[PDB]
Write a structure and sequence with these properties.
CATH architecture of chain A: Roll
Number of domains of chain A: 1
Strand order of the largest sheet of chain A: 2-3-5-6-7-4
Helix content of chain A: 10-25%
Oligomer: homotetramer
Largest sheet of chain A: 6 strands, antiparallel
CATH superfamily of chain A: Hotdog Thioesterase
Number of strands of chain A: 7
Structural class of chain A: mainly beta
Chain lengths: 121, 121, 119, 119
């Protein structure tokens, strides 16, 4: 048995402009796994959502085809995670978004890359 | 502005034995994105959690180094998603888990691969 | 200093039909890295080429957007590697190919997934 | 039928120091796929080899567990490709290498991430 995993119970959108997005959020109990670390799925969801925001900031609509993520450092309760998303390639039919998460001490938590199919403007 | 994304508000563990895990869950409103599809992060979290369960079913403890996921078909409200995880490679220090999600009609929703570092027994 | 890495100096196409591909090849010296193992790029290239063959076998043309690979066991000189490719998802606009490599002892060497844009 | 795919028939190592690597190479005929573009496996092998070089430059030895690559723009015959590698995370047990390839016009060709187990 285990508890539900939730993401974006709180957040602040600091920047969302022209393929560049910055969002902060506070790690809470629903963010965690059984070992008291930020859940792998929670962290991925932070990245994915900010990828979607990048797509919107480009004035586009899109759907994710593929995503890859590297976990570097555990996130902990009360951490303020800064999620920065950037469109690193804007193609005709596809976009590639890089998203990285750093904690309040500037240490890299995780990084992810999203391969998006643009469905509209 | 957007709503929180949640995963495992409900579930049933059908099978969890020797590196093979099957878990069902019902897609609900907190599962969805703004377009009314199962959120990319939600689906990833379903897969990741079942990967962790595979690790446990092997009698091991581990941490995810890297994960990749392919989105094939949208999940929808009230879908019953069947999440099946399998350890496809059990190494000395690393494990590779394949996890796939199918809906109640047997259609493939998504598939993911997790590269785990075994930290204990 | 290091030597060039080559792939497909030899191969045998056992099957190439309707999204299902099997190709065999023998690991040679040009296949190897400094440690005498099959080079990661060599193994990846085997997989990618067979992905392209799956694409051809479906009567389609496509361009690879993204690829992921997991290395499981080292390949060695004189290994006979069996490369099997399958289209695990055939969409209207995208295809997903799974490719796996096993050696002559049936041991899993590596596996990869290719995300293709149908052109 | 298809020809062998080769990588590093030529190269110049511009920098290999403390986790930072730059290597250049000229795309040749053995680099190409049937469509006359740089082969996906060729590009990947360029990236992987430079990842291995980052590893060496850190004074470490390692084995690649997993790799991901995104293809952004086709490489062409006679392109001069600049391959840049960096260790973006150096852990005790694992390293993560980012590798990117740009052509002579400064256009991004591809980028890849390597997940290495330090041995």
């Amino acid at each position: 048995h285990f508890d539900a995993i939730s993401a974006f119970e709180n957040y602040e959108i600091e920047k969302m402009r022209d393929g560049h997005v910055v969002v902060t959020t506070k790690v809470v109990n629903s963010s965690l796994n059984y070992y008291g670390n930020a859940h792998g799925g929670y962290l991925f969801t932070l990245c994915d959502q900010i990828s979607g925001l990048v797509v919107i900031s480009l004035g586009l609509d899109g759907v994710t085809l593929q995503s890859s993520i590297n976990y570097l450092k555990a996130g902990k309760l009360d951490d303020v995670l800064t999620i920065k998303g950037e469109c690193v390639h804007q193609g005709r039919t596809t976009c590639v978004m890089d998203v990285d998460i750093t904690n309040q001490e500037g240490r890299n938590v995780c990084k992810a890359t999203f391969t998006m199919f643009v469905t509209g403007q």
